[PDB]
Design a protein around this ligand. Structure first.
Ligand SMILES: [Mg+2]
Ligand SMILES: [Mg+2]
Lengths: 590, 538
């Protein structure tokens, strides 16, 4: 073990602390001011009798004693740097405070309680011995007291500053940034006080408990990636659109002869950070290289599903729901019916889940979503076909990758407000499925009312114009209705701050403070060119002033709004709680 | 602003610390041991020179100095106790550390880190001044120096130990108890359990009261005993279903006048506060109480109810004493054939009444109670509810006691009832269980009402947001604390955790605004924390 000490007038308190553990101590490292009242020769001869005990001596060069604010802050930053440098890599260092005047003793105590120490304590003797032949009988008589106030874990993970900040033993106060000063300066609203999800978030030391409340920044990439996230609006057809993913899915086709390798979607400057707003038609056009024209192949379908699952696992996602269009990928020529396609995707996902779980690795439990599209070019019987297919998949029953519900989506040019397609949606609720609705992407605030009150839809897509219907806000809020929303996709197809020639503000922050159960999603990964992590991170320059804890409550809302069973909700909540606790403990160790 | 400092052998710290802040302070408290070396006369006269600010001296009885482990632990306990009796109620205080020898300096810094402080600092003087005039002189020359440390927020949950013991009327060594040691050991054990185990580490399913001692959590996991009556009485509660007219059992025959209604409302409020209930929703019958011959319309009666309730709420709040926010629900008695327009009248009255706006008490929803029958199903009144949801109201229902499961289904889906009354036989339709589960439709079930095997346990296992209510206090002759008490013997194997789950489900199913729900969550969390932390000792 390694012990640390600081003393003033007293010269050999370190030997007194060296008997704190009856077994003994292994390493000794003492840091103190440049005052001459400390005697290094006595400590040297004391520790020379024990060669097996390492004895390293360091002093505050250029500072005999603390006298003013500048001297105090200089000594504080140097002892901080020495403390980060000198602790054991995996063990908390030992430390004692039986010596030194108030300033350095308090500074070392605060540094120890902020980083952590194996045991801080005090050693006092009744007879205040001056020579070793005195403290020998002082400890023999028991006069020396081993004053210990309690174990001090500190922040179990903060020492990343040892590496992210280069170790510089020789330096002055002229160049140092106290990140801790910024993390302490502003700590203490009702919301951030009591919207704490994941009850274990009350357990982290007050440093982390308040750090979670700081505004989110673009430099938060590793931490946001290391969180377990949830995606609820993902289109499988838009996963692979270009690049290595497209090459891999194309090469896995059963018959590569009929693979159109000539088409190539055009580039958008700065994509995904579009230099200007884009229309919906071109947004679908960028996904023309994939979709249904290429995914008819069974091998292509298997490769796409496996690649999507692998990417979802790589993005640290723990639960997801996938929107699929089984009818679009059916082909009667090869006896590839829509039901067969859905069954194959179910078996593939179940096999992937089982093989990931059997190895006790990280896996994202995945459930499907069927798409009852607007059915362009008429032929609305496919709506009933899709509902029947979903119902059959739902009472299929056995398995793990279950179908949870249906999705209604499509173009808003037809002006469908959940009334045209209401004539058949009555039967689905009897079985026990769940209904979403892509409503009001750019339409009037009227259709959503029937979408929630006649369709009984528990989720909404986008609905970015909800801010102008406060009456709709109130009824949405009381009914606990989730709102799926895609940051990058909406930003690209509509335009929001801060790109030039636009004044529209992203309604996310007001949606959160209102209390709408909004869950951030990614829509089409390949076309947008951004995974869940990037979509979450873009909120920094999308909605300024947002804090990490709003992200945490967004994740909690995403858990809440998923069409899943109760017991699975408890288990997933427990796993998310533990994982997120470890993440905020260890990842932000920076 | 409050200054706290330790007194050793010299009067150096206190005046320089008091004048260190340019604005100055208002309350200053200094802690010291039983040592006769220190003198209080200088500080006494200095603070008497400025009597506008407050000052006090606390002496650690029976301890002149620290000479062993027992002496130091006793001093630390009394220092922590003096600190906790001396937090300002809301704001964090300032701390000066330069007093005493390094031992009490470190103890005071530990106290500041543990309980949080506004801005702790150090004070040093080169010339070691002695008497007031030359302290002032040295401060004139700028020899004074304040060494600011930082701003510790501290453990928010650990500022709540003032409730268990402000002071033990000057405890002696014979009856001394290390309560602050209990606090520090509970928090360190919680952190160590978090860091060591994983199975216990991840469960944590509740509002972040995880910071109780592990012994407290183990006691909570234990099943209810019939002797926990004091504990449940002390816990804040919520009564989402209470009928005003059935308290003094009355109603149509007696309450036609005005003074009787006022005294009934006051009695209901007094009884409701008497049980420490923080929130309740009341269903009333304005048409049953109107008197046309006296020019007493139903609207007038409802306005009088709202006015007396909000007046009482304001009166209770002005005293800063514990008060119970109450909202009103307009009943729609299912009178069937008689005066079929009464239903439309009641809903229209509700829409008009909820729009009054100003008033802490308001109308948040309507009720569908009345004579239940197949003809009285939800598919009979549904022509009239196309607009109650349009104006943003809320609807409850009472079905399942003798009705049919498809009636419950249509009530859930046609009326879009946010809540539900009774429906004890919901087990026999697992499909209905799933429908009520995923839609998060609450259930209001009163154990005494059905008492006059109970499946509530199975309801918690499945996941119904079950709320326990009084229905009608008077005819049942029991309050909500009694209702919670019957669950012990009435349902064996019920754990004290499920009582808190019932309370939480009740506060989620209340027809309340988002911000009001947020405030109620915070207040409920603080109150349950305090009450369990107090009651675990006894
Ligand atoms: Mg979409
Ligand atoms: Mg009742």
């Amino acid at each position: 073990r390694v012990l640390l000490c600081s003393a003033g007038h007293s010269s050999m308190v370190v030997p007194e602390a060296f008997h704190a553990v009856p077994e003994g101590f292994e390493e000794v490292h003492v840091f103190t001011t440049d005052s001459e009242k400390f005697n290094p020769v006595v400590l040297n001869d004391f520790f020379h009798s024990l060669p097996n005990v390492r004895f390293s001596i360091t002093k505050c060069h250029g500072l005999a004693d603390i006298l003013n604010e500048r001297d105090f802050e200089f000594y504080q930053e140097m002892l901080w740097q020495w403390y980060l440098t000198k602790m054991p890599d995996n063990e908390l260092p030992y430390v004692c405070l039986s010596g030194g005047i108030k300033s350095m003793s308090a500074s070392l105590q605060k540094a120890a309680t902020l980083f952590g120490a194996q045991s801080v304590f005090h050693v006092l003797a009744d007879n205040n011995p001056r020579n070793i032949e005195e403290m020998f009988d002082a400890l023999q008589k028991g006069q020396i007291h081993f004053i210990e106030m309690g174990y001090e874990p500190g922040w179990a993970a903060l020492r990343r500053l040892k590496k992210i900040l280069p170790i510089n033993e020789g330096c002055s106060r002229d160049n140092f940034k106290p990140l801790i000063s910024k993390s302490i300066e502003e700590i203490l609203d009702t919301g951030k006080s009591n919207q704490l999800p994941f009850p274990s978030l009350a357990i982290l030391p007050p440093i982390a408990q308040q750090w979670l409340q700081l505004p989110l920044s673009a430099n938060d990439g590793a931490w946001i990636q290391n969180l377990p996230k949830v995606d609820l609006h993902c289109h499988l057809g838009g996963f692979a659109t270009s690049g290595s993913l497209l090459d891999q899915v194309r090469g896995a086709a059963s018959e590569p002869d009929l693979i159109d390798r000539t088409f190539s979607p055009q580039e958008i400057a700065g994509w995904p950070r579009s230099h200007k707003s884009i229309s919906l038609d071109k947004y679908m056009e960028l996904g023309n290289a994939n979709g249904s024209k290429l995914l008819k192949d069974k091998g292509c379908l298997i490769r796409q599903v496996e690649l999507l699952y692998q990417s979802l696992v790589n993005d640290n996602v723990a639960y997801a729901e996938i929107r699929c269009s089984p009818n679009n990928y059916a082909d009667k020529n090869k006896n590839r019916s829509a039901w067969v396609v859905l069954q194959d995707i179910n078996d593939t996902f179940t096999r992937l889940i089982t093989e990931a779980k059997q190895k006790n690795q990280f896996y994202c439990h995945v459930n499907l979503l069927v798409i009852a599209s607007r059915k362009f070019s008429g032929d609305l019987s496919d709506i009933s076909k899709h509902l029947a297919l979903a119902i059959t998949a739902m009472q299929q029953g056995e398995g793990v990758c279950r179908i949870v519900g249906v999705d209604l989506a499509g173009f808003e040019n037809k002006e469908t407000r959940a009334s045209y397609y209401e004539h058949d949606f009555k039967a689905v609720h009897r079985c026990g499925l769940a209904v979403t609705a892509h409503a009001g992407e750019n339409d009037d605030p009227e259709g959503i009312w029937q979408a929630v009150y006649s369709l009984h839809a528990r989720r909404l897509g986008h609905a970015l114009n909800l801010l102008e219907a406060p009456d709709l806000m109130r009824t949405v809020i009381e009914r606990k209705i989730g709102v799926e929303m895609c940051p990058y996709a909406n930003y690209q197809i509509k335009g929001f701050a801060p790109m030039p020639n636009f004044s529209a503000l992203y309604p996310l922050k007001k949606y959160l403070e209102a209390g709408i159960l909004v869950s951030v999603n990614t829509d089409n990964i390949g076309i947008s060119g951004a995974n869940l992590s990037e979509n979450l991170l873009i909120l920094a320059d999308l909605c300024p002033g947002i804090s990490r804890m709003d992200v945490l409550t967004i994740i909690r809302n995403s858990i809440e709004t998923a069409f899943i069973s109760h017991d699975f909700r408890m288990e997933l909540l427990k796993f998310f709680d533990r994982k997120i606790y470890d993440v905020c403990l260890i990842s932000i160790k920076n």
